[model samples]
Target: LGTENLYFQSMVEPFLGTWKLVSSENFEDYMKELGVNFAARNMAGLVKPTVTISVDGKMMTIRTESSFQDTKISFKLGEEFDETTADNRKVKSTITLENGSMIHVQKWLGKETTIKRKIVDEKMVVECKMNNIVSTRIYEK
Candidate 1:
């Protein structure tokens, strides 16, 4: 079933949906782990961001919107690009598809941060981790 399923599946299908933020945990700590400052953390914690993702072939675009700020990033799978975080940090980022999950890896200042987005029970679950801090955000269509 594995090979057959891989042959029949579109790798980006699961990520091509609009997801509204439902809940988040330890997000501020996760930002701090990436060197985000106090003001940005406080403002970020006050708003729920809606994420919209679209994929065409290997090109993927993601937009995250909130009251405080909005960010859009475009890249191809397995290709690295420069990205500016919402809190304004610069990093080199790459996205990879593993199993059914979309994994984003950010590298900056000799540190790495990872974010994984996957669907479970019709909900989008995003996990962010850096150093010892971990955060989870849930989204619903």
Candidate 2:
């Protein structure tokens, strides 16, 4: 039928839960670049931020709740953010369909900061720029 139909059927939606931070390859280094304080960084190393995602049709709602900060983001398919600054700097995010995969590209903060997302191995892989860190958060639902 339609690409939308396939997208909904293919994506794993049970990822809506609290995920414990299992250990990043370069935890200290990454947080340092993010400007996190020494105490906060140490606390964060043991803290597990909970991420909840809800997908409805072509739109997705992401909730990142933690002991420090909580933020919500809602974006529609093929829609781009214009001159919007949040979670650090001004950026535009656009979602597109590519090879049966939903590719999300965040544009802003020069060529050094572009967040990309794609689903693989029944898990959503989120790649953060800045230091080019890749984190694979598996679904525990």
Candidate 3:
């Protein structure tokens, strides 16, 4: 069978919802790998950001909100675009849906980071990895 026949018709539907952060592990280390400053890392570690994801056909909008700052990103699946990080760094990014998860890749200064989001057992799980550092964040609706 072809690769397209291996999954459901719409994998994106499962990810369109509001997810509240429940727990995080190694997030600070992940941020450090990204070169986040001390002050920003302290603030980021204190706030549990809420993520709202919306999918309209092939376009996806992800809005992250926290007491410190908010970021909104809109992009289409399988397309490359420029994005600004919450700490104000600019990078080239692309997101794609594979199986039942959304995979995102960001490249800046010759470094690349990958983030993946998927639902498992009614919980949203996110994995962020850069170089040798990896972070796992869990969320619930």
Error of model 2, residue 108, in angstroms: 3.0
C-alpha TM-scores of all predictions:
0.89, 0.63, 0.90
CA deviation > 4 Å runs, candidate 1: 1-9
Q: State residue 55's C-alpha deviation in candidate 3, in Å.
A: 1.7
lDDT of 2 by residue, 57-93 (tens): 6567777776876776778667886534323545677
User: Which consecutive 10 residues in model 3 have the weakest lDDT in total?
Assistant: 1-10
Error of 2 at 6 (Å): 4.3
Model 1 over residues 45-113: C-alpha lDDT tens digits? 768888999865456899999997789999988899999988777999999887988899999888899
Choose the strongest candidate by TM-score.
3
Alpha carbon lDDT at 135, candidate 1: 96
Clashing pairs in 2: none
lDDT of candidate 2 vs native? 0.56
Q: Which stretches of candidate 3 lie over 4 Å from their true place?
A: 1-9
Candidate 2: clashing residue pairs, number: 0
